[PDB]
Paper text:
Polyubiquitin chains regulate diverse cellular processes through the ability of ubiquitin to form chains of eight different linkage types. Homotypic Ub polymers of eight different linkage types can be assembled in which the C terminus of a distal Ub is attached to one of the seven lysine residues (K6, K11, K27, K29, K33, K48, and K63) or to the N-terminal M1 of the proximal Ub. Of the atypical linkages, K29 polyUb is the most abundant in resting mammalian cells (Dammer et al., 2011). Our work shows that K29-linked polyUb adopt an open conformation and are recognized by the NZF domains of TRABID and has revealed the use of NZF1 of TRABID as a tool to study K29-linked polyUb in cells.
The distal Ub is bound via its C terminus to K29 of the proximal Ub, and there is visible electron density for the isopeptide linkage. In the crystal structure, K29-linked diUb adopts an open conformation. Contacts between the two isopeptide-linked Ub molecules are entirely polar and involve R42 and R72 on the distal Ub and E16, E18, and D21 of the proximal Ub. The hydrophobic I44 patch (made up of L8, I44, H68, and V70) and the I36 patch (made up of I36, L71, and L73) facilitate the majority of interactions between Ub and UBDs.
Residue numbers in the entry:
A (entry chain A): 1 to 73
B (entry chain B): 1 to 76
Write the structure that this text describes.
Amino acid sequence: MQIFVKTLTGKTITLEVEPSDTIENVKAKIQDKEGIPPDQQRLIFAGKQLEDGRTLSDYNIQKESTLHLVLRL
Amino acid sequence: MQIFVKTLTGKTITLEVEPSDTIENVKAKIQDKEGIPPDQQRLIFAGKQLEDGRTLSDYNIQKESTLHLVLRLRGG
């Protein structure tokens, strides 16, 4: 399934993932496409900062959902 | 009953299953014979991607049927 990760600069990127993939896996994909180290990524969905060890289905992230990407200060 | 699972190279994998087994069980048996994690397996039959929660009989898969195995690349 496809999900979207949006920056606050209005850029949206598309990732191919399965519900079983971890947040850490998503961060790795983001590092590959955008060069941002995973330790600097905060992903946000449903008002929560997403923990690395959980899966997308653990957060009820589904096809075409959007996650927010912010950098850590 | 026996079913067959073909890979992209045309290699054949023979599995012993029952009609009441789920697609998720079939992927487990593929993992045990071939070492491929189930999260990386897509199974195709009669032009459909097969959903994990359904049984073989739900997809009218019978003895000596052949399924196609395609894999996902970690990392896209």
